Amino acid sequence: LVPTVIEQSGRGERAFDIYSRLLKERIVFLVGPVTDESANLVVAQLLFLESENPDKDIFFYINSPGGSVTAGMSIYDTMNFIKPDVSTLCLGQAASMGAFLLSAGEKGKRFALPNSRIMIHQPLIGGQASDIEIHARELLKIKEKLNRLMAKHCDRDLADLERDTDRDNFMSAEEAKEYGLIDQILENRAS
Amino acid sequence: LVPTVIEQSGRGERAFDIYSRLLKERIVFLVGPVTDESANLVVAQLLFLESENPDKDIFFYINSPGGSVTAGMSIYDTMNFIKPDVSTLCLGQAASMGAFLLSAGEKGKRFALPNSRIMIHQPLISGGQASDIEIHARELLKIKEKLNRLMAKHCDRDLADLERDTDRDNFMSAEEAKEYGLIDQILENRASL
Amino acid sequence: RGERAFDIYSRLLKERIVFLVGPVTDESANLVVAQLLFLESENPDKDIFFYINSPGGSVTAGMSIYDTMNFIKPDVSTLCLGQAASMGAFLLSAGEKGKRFALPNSRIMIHQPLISGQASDIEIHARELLKIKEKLNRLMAKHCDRDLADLERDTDRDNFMSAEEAKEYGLIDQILENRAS
Amino acid sequence: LVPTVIEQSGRGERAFDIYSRLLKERIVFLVGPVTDESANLVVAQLLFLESENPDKDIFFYINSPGGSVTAGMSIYDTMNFIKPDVSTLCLGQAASMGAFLLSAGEKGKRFALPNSRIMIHQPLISGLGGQASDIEIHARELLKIKEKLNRLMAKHCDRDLADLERDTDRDNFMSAEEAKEYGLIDQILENRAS
Amino acid sequence: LVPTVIEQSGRGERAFDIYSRLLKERIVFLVGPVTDESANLVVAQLLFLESENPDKDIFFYINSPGGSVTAGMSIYDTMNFIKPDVSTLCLGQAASMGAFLLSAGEKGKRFALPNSRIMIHQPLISGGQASDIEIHARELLKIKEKLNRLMAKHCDRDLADLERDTDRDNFMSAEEAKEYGLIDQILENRASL
Amino acid sequence: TVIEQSGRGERAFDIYSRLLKERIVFLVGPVTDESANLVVAQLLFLESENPDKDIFFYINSPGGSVTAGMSIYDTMNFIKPDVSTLCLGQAASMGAFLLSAGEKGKRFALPNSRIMIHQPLISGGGQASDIEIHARELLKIKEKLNRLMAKHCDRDLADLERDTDRDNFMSAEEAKEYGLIDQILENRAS
Amino acid sequence: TVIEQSGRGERAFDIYSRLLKERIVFLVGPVTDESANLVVAQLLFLESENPDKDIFFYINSPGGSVTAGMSIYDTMNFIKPDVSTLCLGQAASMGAFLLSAGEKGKRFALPNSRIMIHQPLISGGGQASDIEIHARELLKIKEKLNRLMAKHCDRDLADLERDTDRDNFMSAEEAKEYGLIDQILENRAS
Amino acid sequence: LVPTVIEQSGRGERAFDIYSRLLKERIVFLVGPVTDESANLVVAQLLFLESENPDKDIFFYINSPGGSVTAGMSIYDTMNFIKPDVSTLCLGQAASMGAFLLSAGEKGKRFALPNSRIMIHQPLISGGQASDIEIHARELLKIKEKLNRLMAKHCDRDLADLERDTDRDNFMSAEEAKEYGLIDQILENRASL
Amino acid sequence: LVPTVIEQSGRGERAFDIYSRLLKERIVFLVGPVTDESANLVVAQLLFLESENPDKDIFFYINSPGGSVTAGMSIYDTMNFIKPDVSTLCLGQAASMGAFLLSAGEKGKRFALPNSRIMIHQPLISGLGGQASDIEIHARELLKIKEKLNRLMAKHCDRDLADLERDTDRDNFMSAEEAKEYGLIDQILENRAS
Ligand SMILES: CC(C)(C(=O)NCCSc1ccccc1C(F)(F)F)P(=O)(c1ccc(C(F)(F)F)cn1)c1ccc(C(F)(F)F)cn1
Ligand SMILES: CC(C)(C(=O)NCCSc1ccccc1C(F)(F)F)P(=O)(c1ccc(C(F)(F)F)cn1)c1ccc(C(F)(F)F)cn1
Ligand SMILES: CC(C)(C(=O)NCCSc1ccccc1C(F)(F)F)P(=O)(c1ccc(C(F)(F)F)cn1)c1ccc(C(F)(F)F)cn1
Ligand SMILES: CC(C)(C(=O)NCCSc1ccccc1C(F)(F)F)P(=O)(c1ccc(C(F)(F)F)cn1)c1ccc(C(F)(F)F)cn1
Ligand SMILES: CC(C)(C(=O)NCCSc1ccccc1C(F)(F)F)P(=O)(c1ccc(C(F)(F)F)cn1)c1ccc(C(F)(F)F)cn1
Ligand SMILES: CC(C)(C(=O)NCCSc1ccccc1C(F)(F)F)P(=O)(c1ccc(C(F)(F)F)cn1)c1ccc(C(F)(F)F)cn1
Ligand SMILES: CC(C)(C(=O)NCCSc1ccccc1C(F)(F)F)P(=O)(c1ccc(C(F)(F)F)cn1)c1ccc(C(F)(F)F)cn1
Ligand SMILES: CC(C)(C(=O)NCCSc1ccccc1C(F)(F)F)P(=O)(c1ccc(C(F)(F)F)cn1)c1ccc(C(F)(F)F)cn1
């Protein structure tokens, strides 16, 4: 991957890779599987944007199939912690932890482009039976928490999310807006 | 891959790699399979040239066999969203999603070089419980129809046409693509156009 | 005989005992069928004892055994030892009603079909899969004297049953302990 | 593994592979891991000996580290279902399911050799997979299996279910004496003079 | 991994990668499994920050499932040695050696975000003569005791509590970790923080 | 064990079944559950044909599974017949243990046999609790082995503990002096 | 060693080059020809900038190549500057050897450091002549190591021969008592 | 390998595989590398032949490149123990432990075919602590000496000749092997034989 | 392998990777196996330092187990061709071709550190292939190479060709003292006070 290099200005024309250039406009990308490294990269940029300007919105572009719940949560908690409104934008796809982060942007500022693919579902995955029990119970707790938090993000009842996440649930952008998972569908420079 | 490094002038004088220099003239490449990384890098480039001048045409060069529909859609929506005209130029080939994005350039500004190759076809895959197999089957049906209608839109044809002409691989010459409505012009050389 | 099994298994075939052990393949399923045909040939009236210890396997291989059980004249008594799951449970439930048995600590499990190109081909195969799912549910409901609706409900996900719960469900008739007719 | 061949004479001299000779004396072996295949070969031999004579003892030699639970239960129920007493005898080791089967022999006729090794422990799984609903189903099922085994073991040893819960929580090695003691086996054989 | 690049002003405009820019403000990360080199990288960052200012707190963000205990002990001892208080912050998860380090922060400055996951448990080894194995078992016993004791003090609990509660994987919410004495406060947002 | 050849007596036998007909039993190569139980089966069968006739047990083994070895050992001791043991090529580790286990006075080696003894040796477990459990068990096994071999050799336990701390190679003479075997064979001249 | 971060001083440095500017040198992970020679290069460079200022050498290593270790060792001894040694996490085998090699009085450990010493240990050669050659060489190395560590610890050679026959784990206190290190650090309060 | 089957007559017609039929006439083969099981198979054949007739010679055909020395010592000691003289015949080759066994035949009845190849050399090992390696080197030295001594007697030469001449691979023709004292006679055909 | 970076100040402060800093002091390193690539990097550094100053000593640190013969000869001839003296210094180990290069330094300036390891031995090949005519060609060639090396080594050590033939027949380990003794190196350095 050679990222193209770009020139700015503001007394002294500086060069930087195109993603650092887009960081200056407060755009952060979640592309691909959510890992500790990729999620912490997102945290790092969210903290930096907050200290650059705690009053300006941050635009979080999500094109992700999901991944680590724990790494997803670290992105989650950072979005909610910092002063800026984290506005989310689905591009290409937002599934699993991807959809959870997308739906976690500031209400009123969660967007999808028209042909986005959103998907939600319950969690997905040795030792002695004691260790199996412990991990099974923990996994039930994660599912229950993910459903409660997503019921809240979508302004829906818990019962609705248990049912609609029992198996893979694909939604068009329109079906996502309808569900409460996003607010607006972006088509082109107009809104 | 060593990208040759190159020089530019104009009260000041800097040196980028050849792709960053070409990006300065608003040329963007899609080469090989569209993955998440390669699609998002096209998106980043589109967002940038818009910001740099939301009114100048962008020149989207495509040489691709396709790849992820989801990564490719993220290019399509960006292309449509941003203000400037995304002109498309097929060189080498545009197959599956590559042809889809080719057909998605601003009508009147979709081009091919004289020996480009275009190909279009229905989606093809490479699961577990019967309930889950069924959810993913109905979803692959929806994607197939969606892709057909979006292709009918770009091509000014019926959905029935694209249903028929994508049921199996459908190769097109540059002339055949233009007649299909997939592209607009066939650039031969500099002199003419 | 012998037939890639043992002399012990040949001796027990003489006492009309047929084993299904392990996964159901084309190979292991046809050997059951072959034994079944053979035993009907040696006496089309005496019962066959079909011992099942299997997590299941290929549905079409299973159906070959099922249709052979139903076609031959002798009543095929089924007996679960160890486990009978998926296609294995299906075959167990398919024994002659009144002669479907289980040892006290057998594991029984039933569920919907589990699986391993072009969208057109996916559509064709997905539809065949649903027809499969429905046919097994109907047949299993008939085996169990229950409502099609109950089977669809109780096989959405893996459903483990002890011997007692299989008896109650309608999947077997008797739990065998020692010697008590 | 070539098995040696052997003559039984008198009113007709016949030849057997040695293990077939030992089956004729109602001796059955479980050796190595318990799989569906090797367990069902035990079941089949138990059925044959009952068929030949439903009243004589059967002697079940066990040298095994354990293996499949369902496969082992198929031996277990077959032991209890058939009329003959199945005497069990540990040589080398009776581990996990192998010790479950050793302790399942007819009370009074569960034996070990002086330097046998016995070990009991709760179930262990290799690994997991699907959705949380499925992982809940399999965990709930595995906990049922763990109680079934503890409860059966307790009966065999004449102990509280709690006793076997505690003493299987981790690997639990026993000498032959410690196993007699625990109620796993009845007698420790030293030689034939006994 | 492409770390984004960032510019700061003040008597001179300079460029940093984002993690160096965050280091500039006394923030250090332990992300992923604890290895010798990832551990020593944390140590070097603490040595540097103490030299820049031995009296300002250091903010130690932890998102890790654990790792080598010796490597984790190099961080631990470096945290206790340096004059600056090391505040610990759990984001994502802090498990095993990551839980240890999280709890090892300066009492009063150990936090977790609301959905952090903490887990603690006994050592756990992956992969000669009985004499050799005897020696290593004895050593492992000593390590297991020492980790329990150190963590008992971190938690202001008895040793026998930590031995009991680390026999198997012990998962905790942020709130359960606050009760146990493993963190001090849950951070919700810029509440009062 | 390519093709095992056949000989005649009045019936036909493979040569190993023939040697078994004369109460010769082989332990060759590593001691596995299956090779050890084949030795157990032969010993059980030989006892029943003649509970009083000696059994001759050839050992060419580098050893192997402790539990597998123990099963031959307890069988040797259990059965009425004396089990003579005869080392050719090598008896090392559990091989040497079984060689020493032969009926005392009837433990032999050939002049260039190689004998070797040592403490238990393991390849490469999980939680520390499990590690301590298995470590304690491995040491019980070490101590148990030293005590039986001390008893086989009529020697101090501390002697065998000192002499198996590391690999200890013994010639046939050395094993005789040690108490591990009784005589060294050569020729029929005996 | 993901991205090594940058700090400022008046120029920009990666953080390890920054620590080197203050005569701190790290040995981390296994001792290879390349990691050992990088330590050699740092030590040579530090001497030339100031032949009299102490050098501080952090050791978190499980050890590694003997010849690689020796090259750090002879360099430490050769150069004018005192090389202080500081163990964090672990110094085992050649790691512990180098820790002990620090200028006497200037060998430190952190309170939970783990130290470990033992005899030379080899994975797994050709003709017997070559085997005897390499076996004799391995023993010369064992003896040489025991004697230098005896000298580093001010102890009998026979002491170190007895105490490295098998893996010997030492706490920081134990290593101090043994003579392997001098002080145990904690706090700046020192 | 399909061993051909063969019938013999005499008070009764029976069928043997060819190697069993050749065993019937006191012929045993060592073909290929010497392993524990191929060695023990030779031992069992010698035990059987001595019992069939302890006074008729045994003909031991050897075509082997060597193998385990312990396994080869089981044959060696069995050959010296049994009353029948074991005549050795080298066909193809006899190398290392195969050379040893060839030379170990009863003096006067060790032969080679005209184009047999003999080779002798020092032991040669394929593939813990210095203490352990010390012990094993010492043992290997003792084995190398013992093999040299035994072979020196087989050859009626001094020990120091065999040590010298086995330092590296020492190839010999049948005739050179006859001179060295490793065989007695070269068989050409049914000359006088 | 991150190499640290370093400041050289005075009339302008510059930054180098440390190894580049050490090259400026005419220090060259051969570390690890001798391959065509790492040898030619040595040759290139020898050419550069002669270019910068053809009269100052060059100091060649060697920590290497050996490697390619032709690659090592490329260093050897370049050492002798260039005007500067190339002083050699063993640290860690100078084995096979590494000890050939150590002994090839300018007489008087071949040094070792107290605990260095030196070892010399005849060539060894990995492996063979073609027709017997080719195997004869390569064997005849390898024997030429073996004599070339022994003969050169003898010159370096002031010994008979026969001496080095004998003492390379099998692996031959030397302490630093034994190597000074043998004539491989001149002085054993202990510290800077010397
Ligand atoms: C760690 C803490 C210092 C921090 O990250 N500052 C932001 C550093 S970036 C920066 C700042 C200024 C100038 C330039 C830069 C940049 F970027 F250019 F380098 P903090 O502010 C914090 C904690 C948690 C999170 C979140 F979102 F991850 F959860 C977010 N921020 C903080 C403050 C107080 C406390 C107390 F007192 F409660 F302990 C704890 N933590
Ligand atoms: C996110 C949004 C700021 C954005 O992408 N800017 C990218 C322009 S970068 C830039 C800008 C100025 C100067 C320099 C630079 C550069 F390039 F050097 F960094 P936006 O303009 C947008 C949305 C979607 C897409 C597409 F095409 F991908 F879909 C494209 N652009 C936008 C505006 C308003 C809202 C509202 F109203 F919903 F909040 C939402 N989104
Ligand atoms: C897209 C088009 C601007 C283009 O790629 N320019 C690339 C040159 S960048 C440049 C320019 C000036 C100074 C510096 C630079 C640089 F590089 F240093 F920064 P175009 O010129 C074109 C099309 C096809 C091909 C070929 F050869 F690949 F086939 C080639 N060029 C073009 C496209 C369409 C039309 C139409 F259809 F509207 F007539 C007319 N022209
Ligand atoms: C094939 C068929 C002849 C058949 O199996 N014979 C076996 C008779 S054994 C026998 C008899 C005497 C002596 C020894 C033996 C033995 F066995 F010891 F050697 P069939 O009876 C049949 C079909 C399908 C199935 C099942 F179970 F798979 F469903 C079962 N049986 C049959 C009859 C008529 C037709 C018609 F009418 F269509 F022409 C078609 N098929
Ligand atoms: C080795 C010691 C010099 C050291 O690490 N300095 C590193 C500080 S970097 C620095 C400093 C100033 C300016 C710029 C920089 C920078 F950042 F730009 F490079 P020290 O301070 C030490 C030891 C251990 C630890 C810890 F945390 F690992 F435990 C921590 N520090 C020390 C002090 C006293 C003694 C005594 F008393 F025993 F002699 C020995 N060692
Ligand atoms: C089980 C017992 C019958 C048994 O295995 N015989 C095996 C010999 S087969 C045989 C027998 C006769 C004729 C032919 C054959 C053959 F070989 F041709 F088939 P047993 O004699 C016994 C126990 C333990 C061991 C040993 F060595 F493995 F430890 C050995 N033998 C025995 C006797 C009494 C009791 C009591 F009274 F305590 F219950 C229990 N066990
Ligand atoms: C070769 C010798 C010049 C050398 O390596 N200096 C390395 C220091 S580089 C340097 C120097 C000055 C300024 C800047 C730099 C730097 F770092 F920025 F580049 P030397 O000092 C030596 C030998 C051995 C070792 C050790 F520790 F590895 F064993 C160490 N140093 C030396 C001196 C005298 C003799 C004599 F007289 F006997 F020939 C031989 N060798
Ligand atoms: C063990 C001993 C019975 C033995 O091997 N018989 C095997 C001969 S098979 C046989 C025999 C007769 C009829 C039929 C058969 C056959 F073939 F059909 F089965 P033995 O004769 C012996 C020991 C060692 C070796 C050798 F060559 F390996 F060294 C060789 N033979 C023996 C003799 C004396 C003593 C004493 F004196 F110490 F008690 C101990 N052992």
Curated annotation (Swiss-Prot), chain A:
GO cellular component: cytoplasm; endopeptidase Clp complex
Any one GO MF annotation of this record: ATP-dependent peptidase activity
GO biological process, one term: protein quality control for misfolded or incompletely synthesized proteins
Lipoprotein among keywords: no
Protein location: Cytoplasm
Top EC class, one word: hydrolase
Cystine crosslinks: none
Entry-linked InterPro entries: ClpP, ClpP/crotonase-like_dom_sf, ClpP/TepA, ClpP_His_AS, ClpP_Ser_AS
Reactions it catalyzes: Hydrolysis of proteins to small peptides in the presence of ATP and magnesium. alpha-casein is the usual test substrate. In the absence of ATP, only oligopeptides shorter than five residues are hydrolyzed (such as succinyl-Leu-Tyr-|-NHMec, and Leu-Tyr-Leu-|-Tyr-Trp, in which cleavage of the -Tyr-|-Leu- and -Tyr-|-Trp bonds also occurs)
EC id: 3.4.21.92
Active site: S96, H121
Keywords annotated in UniProt: Cytoplasm, Hydrolase, Protease, Serine protease
Family membership: Belongs to the peptidase S14 family.
Cited function: Cleaves peptides in various proteins in a process that requires ATP hydrolysis. Has a chymotrypsin-like activity. Plays a major role in the degradation of misfolded proteins.
Subunit structure comment from the entry: Fourteen ClpP subunits assemble into 2 heptameric rings which stack back to back to give a disk-like structure with a central cavity, resembling the structure of eukaryotic proteasomes.
This protein's name: ATP-dependent Clp protease proteolytic subunit
